[PDB]
Amino acid sequence: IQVTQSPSSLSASIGDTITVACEVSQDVGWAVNWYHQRPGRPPYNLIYTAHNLAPGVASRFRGSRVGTYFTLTINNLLPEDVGTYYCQVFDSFAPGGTRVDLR
Amino acid sequence: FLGFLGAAGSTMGAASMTLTVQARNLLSLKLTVWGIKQLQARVLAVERYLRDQQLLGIWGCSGKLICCTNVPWNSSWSNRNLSEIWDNMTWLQWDKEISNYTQIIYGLLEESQNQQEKNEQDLLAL
Amino acid sequence: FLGFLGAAGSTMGAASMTLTVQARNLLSLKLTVWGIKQLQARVLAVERYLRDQQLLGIWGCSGKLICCTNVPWNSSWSNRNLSEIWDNMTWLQWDKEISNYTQIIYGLLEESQNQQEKNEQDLLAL
Amino acid sequence: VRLDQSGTAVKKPGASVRVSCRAPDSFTVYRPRLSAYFIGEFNIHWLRQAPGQGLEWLGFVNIFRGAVKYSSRFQGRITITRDTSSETSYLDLGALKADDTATYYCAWDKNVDDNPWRLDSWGQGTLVIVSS
Amino acid sequence: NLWVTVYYGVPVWKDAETTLFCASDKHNVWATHACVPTDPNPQEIHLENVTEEFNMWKNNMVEQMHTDIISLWDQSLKPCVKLTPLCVTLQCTNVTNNITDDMRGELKNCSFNMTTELRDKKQKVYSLFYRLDVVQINNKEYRLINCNTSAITQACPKVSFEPIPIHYCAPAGFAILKCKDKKFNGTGPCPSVSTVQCTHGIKPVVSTQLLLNGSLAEEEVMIRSENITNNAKNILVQFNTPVQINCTRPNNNTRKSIRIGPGQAFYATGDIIGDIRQAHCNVSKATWNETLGKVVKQLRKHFGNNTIIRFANSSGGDLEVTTHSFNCGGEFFYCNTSGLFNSTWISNDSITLPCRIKQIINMWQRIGQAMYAPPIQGVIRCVSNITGLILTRDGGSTNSTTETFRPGGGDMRDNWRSELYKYKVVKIEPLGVAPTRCKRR
Amino acid sequence: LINCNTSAITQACPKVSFEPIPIHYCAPAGFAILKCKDKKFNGTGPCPSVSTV
Amino acid sequence: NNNTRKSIRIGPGQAFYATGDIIGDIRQAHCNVSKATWNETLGKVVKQLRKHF
Amino acid sequence: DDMRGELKNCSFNMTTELRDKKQKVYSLFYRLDVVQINNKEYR
Ligand SMILES: *[C@@H]1O[C@H](CO)[C@@H](O[C@@H]2O[C@H](CO)[C@@H](O[C@@H]3O[C@H](CO)[C@@H](O)[C@H](O)[C@@H]3O)[C@H](O)[C@H]2NC(C)=O)[C@H](O)[C@H]1NC(C)=O
Ligand SMILES: *[C@@H]1O[C@H](CO)[C@@H](O[C@@H]2O[C@H](CO)[C@@H](O)[C@H](O)[C@H]2NC(C)=O)[C@H](O)[C@H]1NC(C)=O
Ligand SMILES: *[C@@H]1O[C@H](CO)[C@@H](O[C@@H]2O[C@H](CO)[C@@H](O)[C@H](O)[C@H]2NC(C)=O)[C@H](O)[C@H]1NC(C)=O
Ligand SMILES: *[C@@H]1O[C@H](CO)[C@@H](O[C@@H]2O[C@H](CO)[C@@H](O)[C@H](O)[C@H]2NC(C)=O)[C@H](O)[C@H]1NC(C)=O
Ligand SMILES: *[C@@H]1O[C@H](CO)[C@@H](O[C@@H]2O[C@H](CO)[C@@H](O)[C@H](O)[C@H]2NC(C)=O)[C@H](O)[C@H]1NC(C)=O
Ligand SMILES: *[C@@H]1O[C@H](CO)[C@@H](O[C@@H]2O[C@H](CO)[C@@H](O)[C@H](O)[C@H]2NC(C)=O)[C@H](O)[C@H]1NC(C)=O
Ligand SMILES: *[C@@H]1O[C@H](CO)[C@@H](O[C@@H]2O[C@H](CO)[C@@H](O)[C@H](O)[C@H]2NC(C)=O)[C@H](O)[C@H]1NC(C)=O
Ligand SMILES: *[C@@H]1O[C@H](CO)[C@@H](O)[C@H](O)[C@H]1NC(C)=O
Ligand SMILES: *[C@@H]1O[C@H](CO)[C@@H](O)[C@H](O)[C@H]1NC(C)=O
Ligand SMILES: *[C@@H]1O[C@H](CO)[C@@H](O)[C@H](O)[C@H]1NC(C)=O
Ligand SMILES: *[C@@H]1O[C@H](CO)[C@@H](O)[C@H](O)[C@H]1NC(C)=O
Ligand SMILES: *[C@@H]1O[C@H](CO)[C@@H](O)[C@H](O)[C@H]1NC(C)=O
Ligand SMILES: *[C@@H]1O[C@H](CO)[C@@H](O)[C@H](O)[C@H]1NC(C)=O
Ligand SMILES: *[C@@H]1O[C@H](CO)[C@@H](O)[C@H](O)[C@H]1NC(C)=O
Ligand SMILES: *[C@@H]1O[C@H](CO)[C@@H](O)[C@H](O)[C@H]1NC(C)=O
Ligand SMILES: *[C@@H]1O[C@H](CO)[C@@H](O)[C@H](O)[C@H]1NC(C)=O
Ligand SMILES: *[C@@H]1O[C@H](CO)[C@@H](O)[C@H](O)[C@H]1NC(C)=O
Ligand SMILES: *[C@@H]1O[C@H](CO)[C@@H](O)[C@H](O)[C@H]1NC(C)=O
Ligand SMILES: *[C@@H]1O[C@H](CO)[C@@H](O)[C@H](O)[C@H]1NC(C)=O
Ligand SMILES: *[C@@H]1O[C@H](CO)[C@@H](O)[C@H](O)[C@H]1NC(C)=O
Ligand SMILES: *[C@@H]1O[C@H](CO)[C@@H](O)[C@H](O)[C@H]1NC(C)=O
Ligand SMILES: *[C@@H]1O[C@H](CO)[C@@H](O)[C@H](O)[C@H]1NC(C)=O
Ligand SMILES: *[C@@H]1O[C@H](CO)[C@@H](O)[C@H](O)[C@H]1NC(C)=O
Ligand SMILES: *[C@@H]1O[C@H](CO)[C@@H](O)[C@H](O)[C@H]1NC(C)=O
Ligand SMILES: *[C@@H]1O[C@H](CO)[C@@H](O)[C@H](O)[C@H]1NC(C)=O
């Protein structure tokens, strides 16, 4: 299985609403996990099963599934959300990730 | 609607109007203390329900919330006027003042049911 | 004759013709794991049967496999034609599409039975 | 669950590296009907991140009896083992190449059928540097 | 118009969970005597017109079986001698009399002080322990392996470990739906539902890599997996034909009773009469090749025709997973089975599998308790059928069509899914309401 | 102790009395116990005088 | 006291959890109750207790 | 001042994994858990 996620990078101002895409090559159902990695910090689980929030994650995080097209939507962006995003499908990690930084 | 034992303090007629709500609540792991207590409670509840259902069945009133019979009421049990009983009395006092005569009433009920059923069979056969 | 759940996929009328064969199979050592499992299964079967018997009894339908009532059909639960229902449908789908309206129907049956019995009381008394 | 890993390691090409990952008091579960502490069927995943790159999956071990699944990009020089007594997991990578410089993370997987490959908890990360 | 009519005993069922009691047709570990005697003629009823959804992976019956088996295994161990005094310093020497090349160092001749019947009195006895049972302490000094983090309790010698078939029978008001479709994979609707009072004879065999003594597929080899795309879910393989397996323990073992206290006996391992050879399980080469050919033929469907399927041995882990472990006449084997999953596939002779013996067994991985299997007198020998496989596909790059499959296991639930795949538990709901032209008088 | 090579003993707790107390074995509901009242009843064959308890 | 739990293995799978050395100063375990709150509660209690005496 | 004598630093011979082998280890016990026997000997 091959997983692709885009855009490679994006810059948003404080409070904006941004979304990140994660496309899968085959139907995998809802088995998509979303991970947050702050710079110089270990990654932590953000969304599991593509629409369920991890414990401690604010309700402003939302994930959705459209067939083989998965989206993670960010509301009212805040400075601590800076970093890179990774989507996981089984043993496959999307190359590069999506770096999100303040504008 | 008031709920389980909602009309406990009501008058006789009002309480009888809602017999179903009290009628529907008589029936509703390892060998741990909580588990064994749960099992004992379950068996006690089911046996109590079936004792009551069997006792109704003997008098030929199974399936009927309010059922009439053919034994006269001796005034020795209670000579109170009907209007006072059914409009100015609750079931608690009523059971309080007939606790002793209950067994003979039950026996009369059983005998009357048996005799009536035998007569019905005789009429059905002829 | 087909057996327990023999007419599960059959039509409504054929299934109704043979309710008895599923009706009879609703009811039929130390403290070892197998023993305790057997005992819990036995008690569970007893209570599962008795809940259904109580529900039938409240509606004034104890002892009758088929019982008619005085609750009008609201037509919002299902407006399907009688011929379609009773000749081109199975009980499984029928229960599938009334899974939500069951409780209100049960309550209507209970209240209708209660009022009906008390009405009978008045006539038997007069 | 808290995860603790070993410290930074310095290695030469062709050597071998062992990084430890301890998950205290998390290897055991209490099956209530069975009335004892059993070793749960958890998975410990091992991941690494090259400097400035994305994440890559190495392999995971099943705590129950040590079942291991390895990424084909590392088969033949990778070995993941766990010690149920010490509640630790060991990554043993052999024939290290200069491109293996990365922060190696050990991750905790509850192995829930409804959530495949959930990496709930992560260690602080271990820097492994290889050079001549 | 219309009126509500209540019906009793309608054939309506809902998926539900309930406790299932045992029924079965010397004392055994599973306490099959406690199971109620099953009817000599089981009643099976065909439910035509019925299409019921099945899902063995979310079935409760496997979990309930797991709980019941572990509970039975624990309960059969309580009235047995506890070998807590065995955790004493051992003086073990190499056994080098009439041993073969492969047997060098696998057995140890350990002598130790042991508590006599009189508490103050002590005695020096000797016993034979396999190398996997004793660990060196740093002739040399050894100790029983689990003595560090487990209490030893000897399995009672008189209880048989043989799997007696057991039938899981649901109580009254519940039914068991059997999927009679011969081409049914583990999920999806099964349009051949037939109800039975309870399941056929289930043998709770404990094996890791090869499914022994199991039930065969009716038509062809089946490949059942929850998510064939997920390279972490075990792949349940079922054989349409049985693959026979000879094996035995060639050593003429003798059970020597050592009285370690008041009414407490520890059964040691005495001197072996004759030469000492290697325990080994035989599989017919041609039969295994044919079965592997059928398996790979049925496995190309889920991956493609042009893909390369290669069978490799276990990748590592504890001995129970790396080897094919099972019980045979009271002894627990650990067979290499590297010659089985060794070939690669593209578009009279027997395979000898060197097995190893253990006496300290820690099945179910319970913290604090372990079992000591008493030695079996004489030469044990059992013949079984390999009726299944536990294959775990590896990952791979996107530039390769080579899908490597390796034996897996460990999770006994996966072993018991291959026997409860065609069954499910439903709750009879006999109350039905339907409009009718009848109105109560 | 003669036990020491064949069995392990547990001391009977001194406070429990071994004295026999009469105990009646009562059948559950739906079952009855038939008591043979024949004074010349040898234990086998019919008992002409049967009383239930 | 910042106590340390030291595991002492007294047998097969049996662990006796002992008390290790205490890090830092060793003080007295104590409970704290507000003086004013306790006095007010005692006043209410004594007011309600004068009724029966 | 208030903690004087409330703790006891007790060291004792204890059995180990290997039954024949003994072992010496120490632990801290509160004064209310140990009673003198008539450093001193306690139990
Ligand atoms: C799969 O099923 C076969 C057949 O039931 C099992 O083989 C059987 O194994 C038992 C013990 O493992 C044998 O019983 C023993 O027989 C010897 C010789 O008669 C006797 O001395 C012992 O006291 C004991 O009764 C039994 O004969 C044997 N059946 C055969 C060879 O036909 C096999 O063990 C099963 N596979 C498993 C459990 O993995
Ligand atoms: C992979 O596994 C997941 C989870 O086991 C499957 O997801 C389920 O899909 C069914 C489809 O009918 C849904 O009803 C469930 O709600 C899903 N469960 C989840 C997401 O936890 C998925 O279908 C499987 N996919 C493949 C290709 O095997
Ligand atoms: C398993 O097969 C091997 C050979 O494939 C058998 O080993 C032979 O055993 C006979 C005795 O019956 C010896 O005469 C031969 O010399 C052995 N051949 C060897 C060692 O290469 C073995 O007996 C079989 N085990 C069974 C059937 O349980
Ligand atoms: C497993 O052992 C059985 C013996 O019980 C083998 O069955 C024998 O096979 C030989 C062929 O070499 C026949 O000549 C005998 O008549 C068979 N005896 C029977 C059926 O009782 C069986 O072949 C062995 N399995 C393997 C794979 O070697
Ligand atoms: C699977 O097969 C491989 C090779 O066929 C085994 O690798 C051998 O492992 C032993 C250790 O016991 C080494 O001494 C050999 O040099 C290895 N051979 C190689 C790498 O070619 C591997 O052990 C087998 N796995 C199991 C579980 O038996
Ligand atoms: C399982 O069997 C394989 C091969 O039969 C073993 O691998 C061999 O191990 C020996 C031991 O030194 C090596 O000399 C060989 O080079 C290995 N490969 C082959 C092809 O023979 C393997 O070790 C066995 N697994 C065990 C014993 O656990
Ligand atoms: C017991 O402790 C609690 C919290 O440690 C104390 O509550 C605090 O009291 C201070 C006043 O001294 C306030 O400034 C804080 O805002 C309180 N915090 C909380 C969370 O309640 C409480 O006063 C203490 N009581 C006593 C009797 O010592
Ligand atoms: C309680 O008593 C009052 C007055 O006697 C009466 O009006 C009321 O109906 C009674 N409660 C019920 C539930 O009947
Ligand atoms: C199954 O359906 C067919 C037609 O739909 C019907 O003739 C048949 O009787 C049904 N099966 C049973 C057992 O009634
Ligand atoms: C084991 O050692 C004992 C002496 O302690 C000896 O009598 C016995 O023959 C030895 N057995 C083997 C198989 O070496
Ligand atoms: C005795 O067996 C051990 C295996 O545990 C082996 O390492 C050792 O070399 C053997 N001793 C001799 C003298 O062969
Ligand atoms: C048994 O105890 C004696 C006592 O010193 C010792 O010499 C001997 O080596 C012991 N035997 C063992 C540990 O096997
Ligand atoms: C017990 O000792 C053995 C000796 O090799 C060791 O492998 C094991 O980890 C130890 N268990 C503990 C310390 O819990
Ligand atoms: C299992 O069977 C169902 C129904 O035939 C089918 O939809 C599905 O693709 C099959 N395979 C899996 C892995 O579910
Ligand atoms: C093993 O297979 C044979 C046929 O090869 C069969 O007769 C026997 O019953 C099977 N044993 C089982 C299933 O336990
Ligand atoms: C095993 O040894 C005993 C001697 O104790 C002998 O009677 C028996 O025949 C032997 N069995 C075999 C298969 O050689
Ligand atoms: C098994 O069959 C394959 C089919 O290609 C063949 O290559 C291989 O040599 C066979 N192995 C045997 C007969 O042992
Ligand atoms: C596995 O197969 C290779 C050739 O395909 C062979 O050289 C090797 O000996 C085999 N391993 C065994 C038989 O254990
Ligand atoms: C126990 O000892 C007595 C003599 O003291 C002896 O007669 C008996 O056989 C012994 N029982 C055993 C060794 O089981
Ligand atoms: C008891 O009396 C009966 C009377 O019929 C007789 O048949 C039977 O043999 C007698 N039994 C004995 C032991 O005398
Ligand atoms: C107690 O000691 C530990 C070190 O063993 C330390 O991490 C912790 O902060 C200490 N607690 C307090 C309250 O000082
Ligand atoms: C408690 O409060 C009362 C009134 O406020 C006062 O008279 C008394 O002295 C107080 N006592 C204490 C101990 O505070
Ligand atoms: C030791 O502690 C005890 C407390 O039980 C105390 O009485 C005694 O004076 C202490 N001795 C010294 C030397 O501190
Ligand atoms: C208790 O005594 C031991 C030596 O037996 C010592 O190592 C330890 O530090 C002491 N603990 C105290 C004084 O708190
Ligand atoms: C342990 O036993 C030795 C043996 O003499 C003794 O010297 C020592 O004091 C003992 N340790 C204690 C009692 O703590």
Author numbering:
A (entry chain M): 2 to 91, 96 to 108
B (entry chain D), C (entry chain B): 519 to 546, 566 to 663
D (entry chain I): 2 to 35, 35A, 35B, 35C, 35D, 35E, 35F, 35G, ...
E (entry chain A): 33 to 57, 65 to 138, 147 to 185, 188 to 306, 309 to 321, 321A, 322 to 397, 411 to 504
F (entry chain E): 193 to 245
G (entry chain C): 300 to 306, 309 to 321, 321A, 322 to 353
H (entry chain C): 148 to 185, 188 to 192
Describing publication, verbatim:
VRC01-class members, encoded by the immunoglobulin heavy chain gene segment IGHV1-2, include a five-residue light chain complementary-determining region 3 (CDRL3) and are characterized by high somatic hypermutation. To elucidate mechanisms of Env recognition, we determined single-particle cryo-electron microscopy (cryo-EM) structures of a BG505SOSIP.664 trimer unbound (2.9 Å) and in complex with representative Fabs from each expanded B cell clone: 04_A06 (3.8 Å), 01_D03 (3.2 Å) and 05_B08 (3.3 Å).
From 831 expressed monoclonal antibodies, we identified 04_A06, a VH1-2-encoded broadly neutralizing antibody to the CD4 binding site with remarkable breadth and potency against multiclade pseudovirus panels (geometric mean half-maximal inhibitory concentration = 0.059 µg ml−1, breadth = 98.5%, 332 strains). 04_A06 contains an 11-amino-acid insertion in the framework region heavy chain 1 (FWRH1) that contacts highly conserved Env residues (>99%), providing a structural explanation for its remarkable antiviral activity. In each structure, R71 of the heavy chain contacts D368 of gp120, a feature typical of VRC01-class antibodies and a hallmark of CD4-mimetic bnAbs12. Additionally, the VH1-2-encoded heavy chain N58 is mutated to K58 in 04_A06 and IOMA, mimicking the interaction of CD4 K35 with Env residues N280 and R456 of gp120. Although 04_A06 features a five-amino-acid-long CDRL3 characteristic of VRC01-class bnAbs, it also shares key somatic hypermutations and structural determinants with IOMA shaping recognition of the CD4bs. Contacts between 04_A06 and the adjacent protomer were mediated exclusively via a protruding CDRH1 in 04_A06, a consequence of the 11-residue FWRH1 insertion, which also contacted the primary protomer. D26 is also positioned adjacent to gp120 R304 (93.5% conserved), whereas residues within the tip of the 04_A06 CDRH1 (heavy chain Y31–Y35C) are in close proximity to residues H66 and H72 on gp120 (99.9% and 96.2% conserved, respectively). Together, these residues could form interactions that permit tolerance to structural variability within the CD4bs on the primary Env protomer (for example, the addition of a potential N-linked glycosylation site at gp120 N279).
